């Protein structure tokens, strides 16, 4: 949709809103089939070399056969591997062969009751048996050598990808599945029209989240399984949280306390809850659409958003980390940059036509991308994203100023607001209890 | 062999046994040689274009020339790079050329006393000198153009691969080493017959654990070093540990304490000790065989297994982490799934033909893969592995219930049973001394 950003000066955090979900929640498994042939002058020597390459590919394929620690562990290709085992049962390959005899695309019901889409993408049995067997040994035209090289290339390329990936490839390349084949596969999938438009317009994201699993060679048939993403939760509001360390600004080195919100990442509305994605590789952004894998996700109540408006709210306990290392850095957000400037570091913001526009004082600040192209923090230069959008600065007193440094716990990696206050309970009690006894 | 799994309810952990070891403990370096030439109508125009591509490739190659923090740091290609320096000494290249004059494979003794297998995989010197120099300018047949393209293509593919990898590639592709060449290298390696069968039947794993190091172009010979894995510890028992957070189930949001075993990973018996592999990328599982790199491993006493049958045993101190973040997740094991369900999260297990067959209550539980295809934890759906095997559920009272929440240390990232217990000692003593004083 339309992207907006809100920076919170109290907690040195920014939220960018206006995004839309495409959440991978399930898998669809399809069987891709290549039909093979069983084979028992300079142009003849060229065909012999290409035939040996084809036979070696068949033999080579036969011989083959902050908060990320809170996530669970899944098996990404379990659904595809399960279908591969089903294909090893007696008669399963024959059923797929009989279904694809007169057509290149069919829906086949397996023994376990699952119906899968079957595609025959390459027919090397027909070309070798019909256009290459009667002639072969006197070749009269160089055309058949080149035409055989063109046909056999895809098989060799597929074998090359499987042999260097131990039979499991991701992303799914165009040798495994062409754009025409993938779009045809999407149009016949048991999904809604909304899912079909989302996949057809974003096939490059679909490829990046799909798997190709080499399965079996049996009865002159090569088969591999393409595991395609199912985007079950779509077009729901999503927002990204950016956080930077918030420290005190005492001139003496080593005398400053710091805290950082550790819940940075992608958040998506999902039924009546929120999907949280702490890691950055797990989510792909295509224009306004955020493609996040639910496998690398945490399910949280909708009250997690209360930390952005009030870090001290009683409904939700906001995750923080504390330290005494006040180093300078910058976080590039969707529509601006958060600058954390501490110590003697020089922090500035510039644009290409006018030079330095802003010089940052010690602390944590923010600039929009409207008049800024670059941010310099010490020795590193950052380019800001030039995406269109509206930014809002929300003034507030940094919450690091509410803490007494003498009793501040500054060695917490995975703490929260309540946990930090719990340690402040106890430390103040020791001085309070001892004073009464003394 | 036969895979079995045992789930322990007390510590919320599962062990899958029955695996067999293939541990990479060493390296073997081999030298792979391509002979080059010293060279310099529409058909002649095509030959000149291919010849320029060969010369540019030569010029381009000449211009080129939880517990993972406890691991050590190695140099993976140190052995291969050391051989490369040896080949730069005077007379070393000529020795390899002389040994490969009448044969494509030989064992060559270097200056430093090391013997290495040397392989000539491409001979572009003879083709260019004999089949292409005399005809050089009237070409009468298109066959020589196509035949030249096929021979020079492998050199171009090797150059392209080395150019985007700074001269070091992993995995080793079939352009650097074909399947027939790699099997030939394995058969001549100074290894036992058992090692030869293991490498020959798992060449795809061998490729993923080998390096190709561009070495030298000198005196019309191109040489690169392929560093092959040496699997010295073979066929010993291996097992995998899966752990999940174990929390109390009080209805108040932030009143619960959690602990998780942090020693998840692979374990293999090794000459009276145990090799522990905390990380997941470091170990590749091909059927029943586990291919683990000893570089990313710790050596532990055999008593580390005592933590699986008794986490409170005095012989070994089991590593744990504690917190107050009771989030829901699932861990997919070899033969089932561990489900940690906390708060208001909905957790179910189901199969495709019958629907939801189990609803999880609060706590952490386990389900086998015999009647289960999928597991849902909140908004996340997990497919379970469908591998055949026997699962055992070991009933036991969760050990999180043995801890007094008032004195529980709930901020330990790399603790152990003793460290947690020793911290409980101090807090309990502090109130005990004060009570006695009062």
């Amino acid at each position, epitope marked *: 949709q339309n992207i907006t950003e809100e920076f919170y000066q109290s907690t040195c955090s920014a939220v960018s809103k206006g995004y839309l979900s495409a959440l991978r929640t399930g898998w669809y498994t399809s069987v891709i089939t290549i039909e093979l042939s069983n084979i028992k002058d300079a142009k003849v020597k060229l065909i012999k070399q290409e035939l040996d390459k084809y036979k070696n590919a068949v033999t080579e394929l036969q011989l083959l056969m902050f908060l990320g620690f809170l996530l669970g562990v899944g098996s990404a290709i379990a659904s595809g591997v399960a279908v591969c085992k089903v294909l090893h049962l007696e008669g399963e390959v024959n059923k797929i062969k009989s279904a694809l005899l007169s057509t290149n695309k069919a829906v086949v019901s397996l023994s376990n009751g699952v119906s899968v889409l079957t595609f025959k993408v390459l027919d090397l049995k027909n070309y070798i048996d019909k256009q290459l067997l009667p002639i072969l040994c006197s070749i009269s035209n160089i055309e058949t050598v080149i035409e055989f090289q063109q046909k056999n290339n895809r098989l060799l390329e597929i074998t090359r990808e499987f042999s260097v990936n131990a039979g499991v490839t991701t992303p799914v390349s165009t040798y495994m599945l062409t754009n025409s084949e993938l779009l045809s596969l999407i149009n016949d999938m048991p999904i809604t029209n909304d899912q079909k438009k989302l996949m057809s317009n974003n096939v490059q994201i679909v490829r990046q989240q799909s798997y190709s699993i080499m399965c079996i060679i049996k009865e002159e048939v090569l088969a591999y399984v393409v595991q395609l993403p199912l985007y079950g939760v779509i*077009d729901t509001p999503c927002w990204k949280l950016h956080t930077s360390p918030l420290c005190t600004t005492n001139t003496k080195e080593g005398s400053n306390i710091c805290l950082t919100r550790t819940d940075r990442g992608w958040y998506c509305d999902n*039924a009546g809850s929120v999907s949280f994605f702490p890691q950055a590789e797990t989510c792909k952004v295509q224009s306004n659409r955020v493609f996040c894998d639910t496998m690398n996700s945490l399910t949280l109540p909708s009250e997690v958003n209360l930390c952005n408006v009030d870090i001290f709210n009683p409904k939700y306990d906001c995750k923080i980390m504390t330290s005494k290392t006040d180093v300078s850095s910058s976080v590039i957000t969707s529509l601006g940059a958060i600058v954390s400037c501490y110590g003697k570091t020089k922090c500035t913001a510039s644009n290409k036509n006018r030079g330095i526009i802003k010089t940052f004082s010690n602390g944590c600040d923010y600039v929009s991308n409207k008049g800024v192209d670059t941010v310099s923090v010490g020795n590193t230069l950052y380019y800001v994203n030039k995406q269109e959008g509206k930014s809002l600065y929300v003034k507030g007193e940094p919450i690091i100023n509410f803490y007494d440094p003498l009793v501040f716990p500054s060695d917490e990696f995975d703490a929260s607001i309540s946990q930090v206050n719990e340690k402040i309970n106890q430390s103040l009690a020791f001085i309070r209890k001892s004073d009464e006894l003394l | 062999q036969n895979i079995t799994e045992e789930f322990y309810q007390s510590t919320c952990s599962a062990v899958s046994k029955g695996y067999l070891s293939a541990l990479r403990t060493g390296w073997y370096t081999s030298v792979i040689t391509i002979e080059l030439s010293n060279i310099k109508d529409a058909k002649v125009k095509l030959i000149k274009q291919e010849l320029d591509k060969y010369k540019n490739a030569v010029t381009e190659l000449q211009l080129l020339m939880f517990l993972g923090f406890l691991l050590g740091v190695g140099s993976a290609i140190a052995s291969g790079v050391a051989v490369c320096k040896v080949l730069h000494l005077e007379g070393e290249v000529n020795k390899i050329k002389s040994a490969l004059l009448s044969t494509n494979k030989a064992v060559v003794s270097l200056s430093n006393g090391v013997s290495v297998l040397t392989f000539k995989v491409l001979d572009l010197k003879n083709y260019i000198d004999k089949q292409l120099l005399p005809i050089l300018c009237s070409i009468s047949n298109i066959e020589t153009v196509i035949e030249f393209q096929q021979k020079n293509n492998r050199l171009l593919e090797i150059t392209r691969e080395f150019s985007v990898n700074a001269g070091v590639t992993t995995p080793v592709s079939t352009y650097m080493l074909t399947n027939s060449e790699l099997l030939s290298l394995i058969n001549d390696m100074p290894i036992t017959n058992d090692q030869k069968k293991l490498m020959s039947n798992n060449v795809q794993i061998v490729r993923q654990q080998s390096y190709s190091i561009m070495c030298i172009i000198k005196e019309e010979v191109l040489a690169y070093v392929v560093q092959l894995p040496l699997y010295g510890v073979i066929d010993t028992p291996c097992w995998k540990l899966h752990t999940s957070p174990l929390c109390t189930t009080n209805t108040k949001e932030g009143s619960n304490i959690c602990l998780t075993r942090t020693d998840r990973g692979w374990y293999c018996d090794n000459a009276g000790s145990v090799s522990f592999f905390p990380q997941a990328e470091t170990c590749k599982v091909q059927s029943n065989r586990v291919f683990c790199d000893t570089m990313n491993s710790l050596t532990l006493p055999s008593e580390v297994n005592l933590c699986n049958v008794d986490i409170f045993n005095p012989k070994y101190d089991c590593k744990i982490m504690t917190s107050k973040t009771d989030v829901s997740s699932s861990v997919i094991t070899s033969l089932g799934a561990i489900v940690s369900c906390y708060g208001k999260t909905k957790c179910t297990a189901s199969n495709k033909n019958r629907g939801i067959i189990k609803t999880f209550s609060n706590g952490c539980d386990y389900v086998s893969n015999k009647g289960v295809d999928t597991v849902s934890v909140g908004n996340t759906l997990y497919y379970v592995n469908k591998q055949e095997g026997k699962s055992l559920y070991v009933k036991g009272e969760p050990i999180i219930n043995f801890y007094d929440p008032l004195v529980f240390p709930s901020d330990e990232f790399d603790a152990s049973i003793s460290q947690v217990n020793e911290k409980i000692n101090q807090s309990l003593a502090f109130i005990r001394k004060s009570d006695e004083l009062l």
Partner: antibody, heavy 120, light 111 residues
Framework: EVQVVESGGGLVKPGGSLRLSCAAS????????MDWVRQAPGKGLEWVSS????????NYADSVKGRFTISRDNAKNSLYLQMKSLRADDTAVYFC?????????????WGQGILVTVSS | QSVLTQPPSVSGAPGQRVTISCTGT?????????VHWYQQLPGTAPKVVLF???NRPSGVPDRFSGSKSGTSAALAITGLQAEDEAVYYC???????????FGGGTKLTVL
């Protein structure tokens, strides 16, 4: 408790127009796809139209395509149908329905339904 | 054909098990879409009693089972009760219609 209600349906002449309004109260309206389902008196259910959670995706049955236009306002938690060029075949009780928040889930939240009558 | 075929009426004595069939085509069930089941009283809105061919919503008694096989689906009600007297609808997603196809409806009479 979800309170999904409809309003704005009555008696129109053939070729006339109506605008149905459906207002939701007790759930995160912006995270659900909304539908219209109609039931002619004495017959079964017929799916009319759908709109995704943020309005990107809109679908119509062929029987109402080119004459009905679904819309929503997430600020007001409202659904609209905006019927035009109505015929006698359009007489039915119209339900606005909410699914389970995922793509192929069943309708689990229904309005009470409002009757639309087209006659001369 | 964007059509689901359902028996017009089913009757059963109290305490017996009745079955309601839902026959689909290659556009809806032959494609691989699941079947959901709805129970509607004469004056009220439909209420879902089964989804994903066998999954029971909260508050639905275990008497409703359901199953899918091939291109047809069935809904079974063991131990028929007077409260089960309603019209039952099966629906599926249909790829040709580009939306939801509902069944004709089966009036279940408790004798």
């Amino acid at each position: 408790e979800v309170q999904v209600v409809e309003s704005g349906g009555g008696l129109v002449k053939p070729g006339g127009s109506l605008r149905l309004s459906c207002a939701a109260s007790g759930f995160p309206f912006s995270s659900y796809k909304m539908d219209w389902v109609r039931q002619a008196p004495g017959k079964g259910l017929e799916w009319v139209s759908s709109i995704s959670a943020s309005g990107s995706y809109i679908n119509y049955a062929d029987s109402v395509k080119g004459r009905f236009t679904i819309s929503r306002d997430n600020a007001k938690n409202s659904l609209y149908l905006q019927m035009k060029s109505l015929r006698a075949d359009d007489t039915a009780v119209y339900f606005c329905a909410r699914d389970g928040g995922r793509e192929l889930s069943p309708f689990e939240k229904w309005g009470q339904g409002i009757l639309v009558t087209v006659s001369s | 054909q964007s059509v689901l075929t359902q028996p017009p009426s089913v009757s059963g004595a109290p305490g017996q098990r009745v079955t309601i069939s839902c026959t689909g085509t290659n556009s809806n069930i032959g494609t691989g879409y699941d079947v959901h089941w709805y129970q509607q009283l004469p004056g009220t809105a439909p209420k879902v009693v089964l989804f994903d061919n066998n999954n029971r919503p909260s508050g639905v008694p275990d008497r409703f089972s359901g199953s899918k096989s091939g291109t047809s689906a069935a809904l079974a009600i063991t131990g028929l009760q007077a409260e089960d007297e309603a019209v039952y609808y099966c629906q599926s997603y249909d790829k040709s219609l580009g939306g939801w196809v509902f069944g004709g409806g089966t009036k279940l009479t408790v004798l």
